[PDB]
Scaffold this active site. Structure first.
Site, short mmCIF file in Angstrom:
data_model
loop_
_atom_site.label_atom_id
_atom_site.label_comp_id
_atom_site.label_asym_id
_atom_site.label_seq_id
_atom_site.Cartn_x
_atom_site.Cartn_y
_atom_site.Cartn_z
N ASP A 25 34.59 43.00 42.48
CA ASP A 25 35.79 42.44 43.02
C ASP A 25 36.98 43.10 43.33
OD1 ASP A 25 38.00 40.64 42.89
OD2 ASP A 25 37.63 40.13 40.56
N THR A 26 37.19 43.10 44.73
CA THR A 26 38.22 43.84 45.52
C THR A 26 39.61 43.48 45.02
OG1 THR A 26 38.14 42.36 47.45
CG2 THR A 26 36.49 44.29 47.41
N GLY A 27 39.51 42.03 44.60
CA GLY A 27 40.91 41.64 44.11
C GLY A 27 41.20 42.18 42.74
O1 LIG Z 1 40.21 35.24 39.22
C1 LIG Z 1 39.13 35.54 39.97
N1 LIG Z 1 38.28 34.44 40.49
C2 LIG Z 1 38.64 33.01 40.25
C3 LIG Z 1 39.44 32.46 41.45
C4 LIG Z 1 40.44 32.75 42.36
C5 LIG Z 1 40.95 31.87 43.34
C6 LIG Z 1 40.45 30.87 43.69
C7 LIG Z 1 39.32 30.12 42.85
C8 LIG Z 1 38.74 31.07 41.77
C9 LIG Z 1 37.54 30.93 40.61
C10 LIG Z 1 37.36 32.38 40.38
O2 LIG Z 1 36.47 32.81 41.29
C11 LIG Z 1 38.70 37.11 40.34
O3 LIG Z 1 38.21 37.60 38.87
C12 LIG Z 1 37.06 37.66 38.51
C13 LIG Z 1 36.41 36.12 37.98
C14 LIG Z 1 35.40 35.59 38.54
C15 LIG Z 1 34.78 34.29 38.23
C16 LIG Z 1 35.31 33.47 37.06
C17 LIG Z 1 36.88 34.12 36.57
F1 LIG Z 1 37.50 33.43 35.43
C18 LIG Z 1 37.27 35.40 36.98
C19 LIG Z 1 39.68 37.67 40.98
O4 LIG Z 1 39.42 38.78 41.97
C20 LIG Z 1 40.92 38.46 39.87
O5 LIG Z 1 39.99 39.49 39.63
C21 LIG Z 1 42.08 38.97 40.70
O6 LIG Z 1 42.72 37.62 41.35
C22 LIG Z 1 43.81 37.98 42.35
C23 LIG Z 1 45.03 38.72 41.59
C24 LIG Z 1 45.32 39.97 42.34
C25 LIG Z 1 46.45 40.60 41.72
C26 LIG Z 1 47.45 40.03 40.79
C27 LIG Z 1 47.12 38.66 40.09
F2 LIG Z 1 47.85 38.18 39.06
C28 LIG Z 1 45.90 38.02 40.72
C29 LIG Z 1 42.83 39.37 39.35
O7 LIG Z 1 42.90 38.56 38.55
N2 LIG Z 1 42.99 40.68 39.43
C30 LIG Z 1 43.84 41.41 38.41
C31 LIG Z 1 42.90 42.20 37.63
C32 LIG Z 1 41.62 42.07 37.28
C33 LIG Z 1 40.63 43.14 36.45
C34 LIG Z 1 41.59 44.14 36.03
C35 LIG Z 1 42.92 44.32 36.35
C36 LIG Z 1 43.53 43.29 37.23
C37 LIG Z 1 44.87 43.38 37.66
C38 LIG Z 1 44.70 42.37 38.75
O8 LIG Z 1 44.28 43.06 39.82
#
Ligand SMILES: O=C(N[C@H]1c2ccccc2C[C@H]1O)[C@H](OCc1cccc(F)c1)[C@H](O)[C@@H](O)[C@@H](OCc1cccc(F)c1)C(=O)N[C@H]1c2ccccc2C[C@H]1O
Lengths: 99, 99
Positions: A25-27
Site C-alpha cells: 500500500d503506497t497510500g
Molecule cells: O483505505 C484503503 N482502501 C480503501 C479505499 C480507499 C479509497 C476508495 C475506496 C476504498 C476501499 C478500500 O480499498 C487503503 O488501506 C488498505 C485497505 C484495503 C482494503 C480494505 C480496507 F478497509 C483498508 C489506503 O491505502 C489507506 O491505507 C490509506 O488511505 C489514504 C490516506 C492517506 C493519508 C492520510 C489518510 F487519512 C488517508 C490510509 O489510510 N493511510 C494511512 C495509514 C495506513 C496504515 C498505517 C499508517 C497510516 C497513516 C496514513 O498513511
C-alpha cells in the site's frame, strides 16, 4: 517483480514464522497488521485513515519477509481490516511506482 | 516516471478543469476526492478504510488527467482527508509496483 494493479497487490509475507497475506500500500505511511502476538515492548500510536483513527500497538525492529525480501522495521498491530505493508517497509525492499 | 516512496507519492491531477494534489494509492480500490462539484447523476456508496466507512457520491465516466496521462473512470466524492487516486485509475495510466 513488476506488479500491475488490475487486482489488489496482495503478497505473502512471513512474520513470526507464519505466512500471511498483505497489501502493498503506497497510500499507507506505516505498516499495520491484524491483531497478532509480537515480541518485546510496544508503544502507543494513533493512525488515521479514510474513516477515522484507530489505536495500534507499535513494535520496533521487527523482522518481516515480504515476497522473499527481508526487512527489519516498525510494525503496527491493531484493528486494521487487512494487513498493510506501508511505505516504511516498501522503501526497504526498494519498491517504486512506475508509469 | 519512477516515483520513490520516501515521501507520500503525491501528484498533480486535473479534473473538471481544476488542478488538485492527489495520492497515488495502490491500497485504494477506488478513487475518492474531497468534496467538489461534478457533472452528471451520482449514486450513494459507502467505502471502508482504516477507521471505518464514509459515505461518498459515485460519479461514473469521469475524465481525469494524472501527470499528463488521460484516464477515464468512476470517481467518488466525499469527506476523505486526502485526494486518493486508486487502482481503478492507476491501471489506466499503466502504473505498476516494482521491486
Ligand atoms: O483505505 C484503503 N482502501 C480503501 C479505499 C480507499 C479509497 C476508495 C475506496 C476504498 C476501499 C478500500 O480499498 C487503503 O488501506 C488498505 C485497505 C484495503 C482494503 C480494505 C480496507 F478497509 C483498508 C489506503 O491505502 C489507506 O491505507 C490509506 O488511505 C489514504 C490516506 C492517506 C493519508 C492520510 C489518510 F487519512 C488517508 C490510509 O489510510 N493511510 C494511512 C495509514 C495506513 C496504515 C498505517 C499508517 C497510516 C497513516 C496514513 O498513511
Amino acid at each position: 517483480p513488476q506488479i500491475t494493479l488490475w487486482q489488489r497487490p496482495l503478497v505473502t509475507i512471513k512474520i513470526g514464522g507464519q505466512l500471511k497475506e498483505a497489501l502493498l500500500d503506497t497510500g499507507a505511511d506505516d505498516t499495520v497488521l491484524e491483531e497478532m502476538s509480537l515480541p518485546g515492548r510496544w508503544k502507543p500510536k494513533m493512525i488515521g485513515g479514510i474513516g477515522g483513527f484507530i489505536k495500534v500497538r507499535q513494535y520496533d525492529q521487527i523482522l518481516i519477509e515480504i515476497c522473499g525480501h527481508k526487512a527489519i522495521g516498525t510494525v503496527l498491530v491493531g484493528p486494521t481490516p487487512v494487513n498493510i505493508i506501508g511505505r516504511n517497509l516498501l522503501t526497504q525492499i526498494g519498491c517504486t511506482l512506475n508509469f
